[PDB]
Design a protein around this ligand. Structure first.
Ligand SMILES: C[C@@H]1CC[C@@]2(OC1)O[C@H]1[C@@H](O)[C@H]3[C@@H]4CC[C@H]5C[C@@H](O[C@@H]6O[C@H](CO)[C@H](O[C@@H]7O[C@H](CO)[C@@H](O)[C@H](O[C@@H]8OC[C@@H](O)[C@H](O)[C@H]8O)[C@H]7O[C@@H]7O[C@H](CO)[C@H](O)[C@H](O[C@@H]8O[C@H](CO)[C@@H](O)[C@H](O)[C@H]8O)[C@H]7O)[C@H](O)[C@H]6O)[C@H](O)C[C@]5(C)[C@H]4CC[C@]3(C)[C@H]1[C@@H]2C
Ligand SMILES: *[C@@H]1O[C@H](CO)[C@@H](O[C@@H]2O[C@H](CO)[C@@H](O[C@@H]3O[C@H](CO[C@H]4O[C@H](CO)[C@@H](O)[C@H](O)[C@@H]4O)[C@@H](O)[C@H](O[C@H]4O[C@H](CO)[C@@H](O)[C@H](O)[C@@H]4O[C@H]4O[C@H](CO)[C@@H](O)[C@H](O)[C@@H]4O[C@H]4O[C@H](CO)[C@@H](O)[C@H](O)[C@@H]4O)[C@@H]3O)[C@H](O)[C@H]2NC(C)=O)[C@H](O)[C@H]1NC(C)=O
Ligand SMILES: CCCCCCCC/C=C\CCCCCCCC(=O)OC[C@H](COP(=O)(O)OCCN)OC(=O)CCCCCCC/C=C\CCCCCCCC
Ligand SMILES: CCCCCCCC/C=C\CCCCCCCC(=O)OC[C@H](COP(=O)(O)OCCN)OC(=O)CCCCCCC/C=C\CCCCCCCC
Ligand SMILES: CCCCCCCC/C=C\CCCCCCCC(=O)OC[C@H](COP(=O)(O)OCCN)OC(=O)CCCCCCC/C=C\CCCCCCCC
Ligand SMILES: CCCCCCCC/C=C\CCCCCCCC(=O)OC[C@H](COP(=O)(O)OCCN)OC(=O)CCCCCCC/C=C\CCCCCCCC
Ligand SMILES: *[C@@H]1O[C@H](CO)[C@@H](O[C@@H]2O[C@H](CO)[C@@H](O)[C@H](O)[C@H]2NC(C)=O)[C@H](O)[C@H]1NC(C)=O
Ligand SMILES: *[C@@H]1O[C@H](CO)[C@@H](O)[C@H](O)[C@H]1NC(C)=O
Ligand SMILES: *[C@@H]1O[C@H](CO)[C@@H](O)[C@H](O)[C@H]1NC(C)=O
Ligand SMILES: [Mg+2]
Lengths: 43, 434, 148, 111, 196, 35, 253, 85
């Protein structure tokens, strides 16, 4: 469990959120507020 | 202490059957009364060692099927027999006594391979040990293929006569009373697994709402057969079962529980989880332990099932709120021996016992309360008996409980939950309006 | 038998590091007809985890009709927790061999058995600060709601 | 070692050393005088005194509020003297419930 | 809390009082005691330990709902809950049998963050003391509190240099730190690390 | 006891019901709320 | 897309993650059988020595004292067990006796093809135990001349005499009637003349599928002989005769 | 006396259950529906702005009913799930 992992194991356990995830990050970057910075840094 | 000599044994023939993992003694005696005032008593003599472990003692006339009031007393020890009608001063009457001990012979070699046959050694008394003068006496052993003695006596008269299926002894024309100076020791072949339940506790949960009675039993099982030398070896075991050699081997592979007539929801559980090698056919529950129980190995497990309640309760005639329950006392493997039995019956939340009767004398009876699912006050009424020595298929009885369960407490079970829900709601109200 | 220095056994209160225990064992000799005390001065007790931590020499402190009792002086248990074996093996050639060991767990000190914060003298200036801050805070809260 | 083996004893570690009492007493006296100085500054020097005081029912709510504030610190001080945590929790729950109501009533009434 | 385990690492023993995070077990024991004394359902501790993870896999859905209710409207929080209820990346470590620390360690991860947002967005002190208390509970329940301890300061710092400092960051962050650090020092396994 | 296929169907139905009620709520809120 | 999301996150959980870790569904359970044997038939104060990634189970299911377990905090106490399971039996019997070890259990999936047995994570034992005892153990000897890791007839004379090899292949050749046993995880033939006899340990349990095997230390000899001499006396009884030979030994102290 | 109790046992009638265990799931679901169709009105009443006395009255009057119904559904459901009474 202490290793890196390829790209299939990201679509495996996140069906279609994996390509809405960059979209969500960009749409938070569009209108920055206080909490959006926290969410972006966390992401 | 010696009882007043009052009777004379004019015939005394005893037979011991060693075929089913517990000594079952059967003595047939014709008895004559000494000329005196008519007495109604009889004292059978058990040695202090054997008397410590005896689980059944009956005595009946040959002519009449009905039994007598056979009872144990409370260093030779005695058991009391009492007749319905006083015997004449000079009369001759036959009688038959049956006792069931709880001691089996120890394995003689004690180290045998898992394919060899084992021999057992048992130590008894040759000459009859009675409290009265005996005239004629005969001794017979049955139930095994081959018998042999061990340090035989030089005297020819005290020597067993072999028979095809039995091992008899020559009749002695005159024997004095209290004669126990010859300790016979005999070895015999026996291939049974020699089970022993060190501790059984079985719970019986009555329930009137669902109308089901469910049994749960917790066995602690020990094999008493001869241990195996060179230690375990799976190769030998799995190579011998592929040949036709699983005839009467002395290790336990499959047990056969005998449940009541219609059982459902069988389960077989172990301390470390669920065992999947169980199989419930009609009126039979086959169980395969995790590992075969060789000599000296312990296996502790649990087995449970469910039955309809209409077969065990009966509402009374005079009133519709007095119930009589008849719980079976034992139903397990075919021929085991129990060294402790703890029988717990859990009557419903508001029951109240009126009568308790048992067909086998118990050691201790007590009444407590124990809380279970949705028991919000005083739980269930637990009634526990403690028996000490019991045999599997000859200690067959039914404990009869007689209690009452009024409808004023039958419907209190939903109300006792309605009370909590109403209190929670009236608390949320105050917490939200303040 | 081994037990606390004051009398209480191990089953009442278990052992902890830097405790005071005591050990005692009794020997007897068979001269062919009846037992007698066995006067020997070479016996040694070993308290050992994996290699000896204590190796004391027993002294004769007890006498019986047919038994000689040897005991160790009150000794402080080692400074590290673990699972220690108390052992006494009398093995000298020309004479019978006797061993009797027992394995006991010696636990660490619980939070309730450390010295309190006021028994120490180095930390009397750190409790005065807390008490003063608490008193000042109480008075401040009282004077805050009672001032224009 | 057929015959006999040498004796062995365990050499313990030296315990950490406390400090002399007079220094601690001096440093306690300093903190005490500092606290007294703060109190004196509040009372007289800074002219920050009890201008208005609540009366009647508002004064009873004031007494309740002070009782809560002081009772929590009494609970904590008693817990610092080897009182069980569960007992402290129960004594705090049996005081917060009336105390919260009284304190909120005071803080809404007085303002 | 003072358990000395002499049935592991046999010659050395193990001090299980200061090598263990006692937050999962205390919660399981509290749930067992509540289910056995205040509801009338005596349930074997094995069943509580087994079914702990599925039960606590709905509180994390609620926490994600209440945390997305801050970043956007409530209508956009229910979707997040619907996502985190059934997603294999979180199901993998919270299956019906798993009884690890992460079973309880993600729920709190969300709850603390929720309060932090609620504290940083409004500026109140009572919403930072709740974040400090749930950060102490996460410190007790899991060794991954270092993530929060290194992520909240990053948020505050990124708001400092971006030029968005206000009088709300001061109160929120200083209260959170001053309470959370001294509260997390109370775990015997953590010890004095938060300053060393 | 409930089988495995029955449990699979139950889980799928719960997920479908949840994902439909969420969309119903969102489509009601998007119109009925003042934008 | 939301519906495909549900139909995916249900299938993945059904297929991959919902797999019991104590019962192989291929329904075989040889771990619980051996652990229950240890729990029932061994005295409560006995110590069991196994590799460090089963200790928790042994503590939870078998309820016996272990020497190492999963939360590895002392890395030398694990090197001790690594050196025990990779040295000749005459040194393992001395390393395992000063720690008061009664039983030793190994995993062996050569009959069902388990893959995660102890004979293929042997190399990790060798590495861990070699870091702090370079002279005692050397990884170079376990590999053969050409540099391969074999358990076949052409295996190195250092692995053939190790403890784990002698302990996990005790009766495996004789299991098959022909006398030519085929390992499944390694896919290598095994002859009954390969495995040497075990003189200091004696087998006390092994599961139905030979997966978990529990051995016990023999009690030291009463007359003071080395147990290897007892073994050579019991296996070579009639032919091992010498007429007269003055023994060469140090002067009696 | 064992003989007379054993005589009374067989003579008497058998046990007729109140509500058969085969038709209890029906009552379970038909009571689970009602016990929430009513207890929502309680929360609506307490939430609604009105006189305190009227709120109390129209809360308790239809809270007692929900209490009884829930306390009678939680027995049928418990029996139907396999954990009797
Ligand atoms: C709001 C809550 C209410 C409660 C609940 O969740 C949401 O909704 C319940 C729902 O209704 C479910 C039940 C619906 C009815 C189903 C019936 C089914 O019965 C089967 O059992 C066979 C056995 O012989 C029968 O024949 C036959 O009839 C059928 O083949 C059973 O196998 C599964 C079952 C009982 C379901 C089990 C799980 C639940 C109870 C769900 C769960 C508790
Ligand atoms: C993790 O697990 C591992 C493995 O399980 C643990 O590792 C073990 O730890 C043990 C304790 O730390 C350790 O035991 C010590 O080993 C020392 C090794 O020394 C080596 O060199 C010497 C020569 O210098 C050799 O003789 C020796 O054999 C080694 O090769 C020993 O030296 C230690 O011996 C001392 O303690 C034992 C036990 O009490 C005594 O029997 C022995 O006589 C020594 O005692 C002296 O020192 C102690 C110190 O407390 C004194 O109390 C005592 O009175 C003696 O004092 C005399 O000597 C000192 C020093 O000269 C002098 O100041 C004083 O005045 C007296 O003259 C001891 O044997 C294990 O070896 C070690 N095992 C391995 C494999 O590494 C590890 O601890 C675990 N981790 C944790 C955190 O627990
Ligand atoms: C007022 C509300 C304040 C609540 C804020 C919590 C932050 C404080 C944390 C410290 C409290 C820990 C605790 O309660 O355990 C106390 C305990 C018992 O003390 P006593 O012997 O009874 O009395 C000593 C007298 N000198 O002392 C200890 O040694 C604790 C050691 C570390 C505590 C480990 C924390 C336990 C898990 C905490 C989270 C679990 C809560 C789950 C509940 C749901
Ligand atoms: C006042 C009255 C108020 C009533 C409030 C009722 C609330 C009920 C909530 C408690 C439900 C706990 C269910 C526990 C449970 O399911 O046990 C698992 C039991 C297995 O136990 P065994 O050891 O195998 O026994 C079988 C022997 N033949 O069966 C199951 O696995 C089914 C799992 C059902 C999922 C329940 C999910 C709810 C989780 C609750 C958290 C605890
Ligand atoms: C409350 C609604 C009551 C529904 C009653 C129907 C119950 C039912 O029929 O299930 C039967 C069935 C089998 O019963 P038997 O063991 O065969 O007993 C036979 C004795 N007659 O019971 C079960 O085992 C079901 C197991 C639990 C279901 C698992 C899914 C649970 C989902 C969790 C929902 C919690 C979310 C709510 C918040
Ligand atoms: C929440 C809603 C769904 C709840 C699902 C629970 C159904 C499965 C529960 C179950 O299988 O019971 C297992 C187990 C069996 O108990 P035993 O130890 O065998 O009793 C001994 C008597 N001889 O029961 C439990 O552990 C607790 C279950 C009680 C909760 C039932 C409440 C039903 C909803 C109200
Ligand atoms: C399993 O059953 C055996 C048989 O009764 C139990 O063994 C007894 O254990 C107690 C305490 O350990 C001893 O005092 C008895 O002498 C043991 N009996 C026999 C016949 O040896 C055992 O405790 C049970 N439970 C477990 C977990 O093994
Ligand atoms: C009988 O059982 C009761 C109930 O626990 C107990 O108090 C009593 O001591 C027992 N008596 C005997 C002789 O076992
Ligand atoms: C010690 O005991 C022996 C045997 O009982 C006795 O002869 C002797 O006098 C005793 N000595 C002392 C000092 O008590
Ligand atoms: Mg982990």
């Amino acid at each position: 469990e202490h290793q890196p992992v390829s790209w299939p194991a990201f679509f495996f356990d996140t069906h279609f959120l994996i390509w809405l995830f960059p979209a969500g990050v960009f749409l938070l970057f569009l209108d920055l507020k206080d909490e959006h910075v926290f969410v972006i840094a966390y992401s | 202490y010696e009882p007043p000599a009052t009777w004379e044994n004019v015939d005394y023939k005893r037979t011991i059957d060693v075929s089913n993992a517990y000594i079952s003694e059967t003595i047939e005696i014709t008895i004559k009364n000494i000329a005196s005032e008519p007495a109604t008593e009889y004292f059978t003599a058990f040695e202090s060692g054997i008397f410590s472990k005896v689980s059944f003692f009956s005595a009946y006339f040959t002519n009449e099927a009905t039994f007598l009031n056979s009872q144990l007393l409370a260093e030779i020890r005695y058991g009391i027999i009492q007749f319905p009608n006083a015997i004449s001063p000079q009369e001759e009457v036959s009688l038959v006594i049956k006792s069931f001990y709880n001691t089996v012979g120890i394995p003689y070699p004690e180290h045998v391979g898992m394919s060899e046959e084992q021999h057992l050694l048992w130590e008894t008394n040759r000459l009859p040990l009675s409290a009265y003068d005996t005239k004629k006496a005969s001794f017979t052993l049955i139930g095994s293929s081959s018998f042999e003695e061990y340090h035989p006596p030089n005297d020819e008269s005290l020597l067993g006569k072999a028979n095809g299926n039995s091992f008899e002894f020559g009749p002695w024309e005159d024997i004095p009373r209290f004669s126990s100076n010859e300790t016979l020791a005999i070895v015999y072949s026996h291939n049974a697994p020699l089970n022993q339940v060190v501790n059984l506790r079985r719970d019986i949960w009555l329930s009137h709402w669902a109308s089901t009675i469910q049994f749960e039993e917790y066995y602690e099982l020990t094999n008493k057969a001869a241990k195996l030398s060179k230690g375990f070896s799976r190769l030998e075991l799995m190579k011998q079962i592929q040949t036709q050699n699983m005839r009467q081997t002395h290790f336990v592979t499959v047990l056969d529980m005998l449940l009541p007539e219609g059982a459902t929801d069988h389960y077989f559980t172990d301390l470390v989880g669920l065992v999947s090698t169980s199989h419930a056919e009609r009126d039979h529950f086959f169980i395969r332990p995790r590992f075969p129980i060789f000599g000296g190995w312990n296996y502790n497990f649990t087995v449970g099932w469910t039955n309809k309640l209409s077969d065990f309760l009966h509402v009374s005639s005079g009133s519709d709120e007095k119930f009589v329950a008849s719980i079976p006392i034992l139903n397990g493997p075919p021929d085991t021996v129990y060294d402790n039995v703890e029988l717990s019956v859990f009557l419903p939340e508001g029951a109240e016992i009126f009568d308790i009767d048992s067909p086998v004398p118990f050691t201790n009876v007590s009444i407590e309360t124990q809380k279970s699912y949705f028991d919000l006050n005083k739980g269930h009424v637990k009634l526990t008996f403690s028996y000490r020595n019991l045999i599997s298929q000859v200690a067959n009885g039914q404990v009869l409980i007689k209690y009452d369960y009024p409808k004023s407490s039958f419907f209190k079970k939903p109300l006792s939950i309605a009370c909590y829900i109403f209190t929670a709601l009236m608390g949320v109200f105050v917490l939200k309006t303040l | 038998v081994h037990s606390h220095a004051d009398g209480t056994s191990y089953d009442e209160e278990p052992y902890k590091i830097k405790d005071k225990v005591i050990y005692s064992v009794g020997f007897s000799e068979w001269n062919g007809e009846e037992w007698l005390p066995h006067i020997a001065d070479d016996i040694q007790f070993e308290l050992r985890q994996v290699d000896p931590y204590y190796r004391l020499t027993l002294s004769p402190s007890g006498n019986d009709s047919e038994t000689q009792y040897y005991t160790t002086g009150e000794f402080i248990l080692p400074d590290r927790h673990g699972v220690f074996t108390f052992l006494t093996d009398y093995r000298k050639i020309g004479l019978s061999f006797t061993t009797d060991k027992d394995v006991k767990a010696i636990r660490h000190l619980a939070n309730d058995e450390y010295p309190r914060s006021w028994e120490i003298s180095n930390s009397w200036v750190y409790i005065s600060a807390i008490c003063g801050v608490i008193v000042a805070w109480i008075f401040f809260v009282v004077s805050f709601v009672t001032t224009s | 070692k057929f015959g006999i083996k040498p004796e062995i004893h365990h050499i313990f570690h030296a315990e950490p050393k406390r400090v002399a009492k007079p220094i601690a007493v001096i440093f306690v006296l300093i903190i005490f005088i500092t606290i007294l100085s703060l109190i004196v500054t509040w009372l007289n020097s800074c002219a920050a005194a009890f201008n208005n005081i609540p009366t009647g029912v508002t004064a009873v709510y004031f007494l309740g509020f002070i009782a809560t504030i002081v009772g929590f610190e009494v609970i904590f001080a008693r817990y610092y003297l080897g009182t069980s945590i569960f007992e402290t929790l129960f004594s705090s729950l049996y005081l917060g419930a009336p105390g919260l109501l009284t304190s909120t009533k005071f803080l809404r009434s007085f303002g | 809390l003072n358990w000395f385990d002499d049935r592991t690492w046999y010659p050395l023993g193990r001090v299980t009082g200061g090598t263990l995070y006692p937050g999962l077990m205390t919660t399981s024991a509290f749930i067992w005691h509540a289910l056995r004394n205040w509801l009338g359902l005596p349930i074997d501790i094995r069943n509580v330990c087994v079914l702990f993870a599925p039960l606590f896999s709905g509180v994390t859905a609620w926490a994600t709902y209440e945390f997305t209710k801050e970043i956007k409207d409530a209508s956009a929080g229910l979707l997040a809950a619907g996502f985190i209820a059934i997603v294999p990346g979180y199901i993998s470590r919270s299956v019906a049998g798993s009884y690890d620390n992460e079973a309880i360690a993600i729920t709190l991860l969300m709850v603390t963050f929720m309060f932090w947002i609620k504290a940083q967005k409004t500026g109140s002190i009572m919403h930072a003391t709740c974040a400090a208390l749930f950060y102490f509970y996460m410190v007790s329940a899991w060794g991954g509190y270092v993530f929060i301890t290194n992520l909240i300061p990053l948020h505050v710092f990124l708001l400092i240099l971006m030029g968005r400092y206000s009088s709300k960051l001061y109160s929120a962050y200083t209260t959170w730190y001053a309470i959370g650090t001294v509260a997390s020092m109370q775990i015997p396994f953590v010890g004095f690390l938060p300053i060393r | 006891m409930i089988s495995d296929e029955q449990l699979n169907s139950l889980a799928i139905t719960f997920g479908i019901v949840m994902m439909t009620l969420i969309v119903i709520y969102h489509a009601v809120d998007s119109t009925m709320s003042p934008k | 897309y939301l519906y495909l999301f549900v139909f995916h996150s249900t299938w993945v959980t059904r297929t991959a993650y919902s797999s019991p870790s104590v019962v192989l569904p291929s329904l075989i359970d040889d771990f619980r059988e051996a652990y229950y044997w240890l729990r029932m038939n061994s005295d409560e104060d006995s110590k069991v020595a196994a590799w460090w990634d089963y200790g928790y189970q042994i503590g939870g299911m078998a309820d016996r004292t272990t020497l190492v377990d999963n939360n590895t905090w002392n890395n030398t106490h694990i090197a001790i067990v690594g050196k025990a399971m990779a040295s000749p039996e005459e040194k393992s019997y001395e390393i395992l006796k000063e720690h008061d070890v009664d039983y030793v259990l190994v995993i062996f999936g050569g009959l069902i093809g388990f893959g995660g047995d102890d004979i293929n994570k042997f190399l990790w034992m060798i590495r861990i135990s070699e870091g702090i005892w370079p002279e005692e153990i050397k990884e170079r000897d376990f590999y053969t001349a050409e540099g391969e890791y074999r358990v076949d007839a052409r295996a190195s004379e250092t692995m053939r005499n190790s403890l784990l090899y002698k302990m996990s292949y005790k009766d495996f050749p004789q299991l098959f009637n022909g006398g030519q046993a085929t390992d499944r995880v390694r896919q290598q033939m095994i002859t009954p003349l390969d495995v040497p006899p075990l003189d200091y340990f004696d087998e006390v349990f092994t599961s139905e599928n030979w997966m978990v095997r529990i051995y016990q230390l023999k009690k030291d000899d009463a007359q003071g002989r080395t147990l290897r001499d007892v073994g050579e006396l019991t296996r070579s009884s009639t032919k091992t005769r010498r007429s007269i030979k003055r023994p060469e030994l140090g002067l009696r102290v | 006396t064992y003989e007379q109790l054993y005589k009374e046992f067989h003579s008497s009638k058998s046990f007729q259950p109140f509500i058969h265990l085969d038709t209890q799931p029906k009552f379970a679901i038909c009571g689970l529906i009602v016990t929430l169709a009513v207890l929502s009105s309680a929360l609506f009443a307490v939430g609604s702005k009105s006189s305190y006395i009227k709120k109390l009255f129209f809360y308790t009057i239809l809270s007692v009913i929900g209490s009884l119904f829930a306390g009678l559904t939680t027995v049928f459901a418990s029996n139907s799930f396999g954990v009797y009474v």
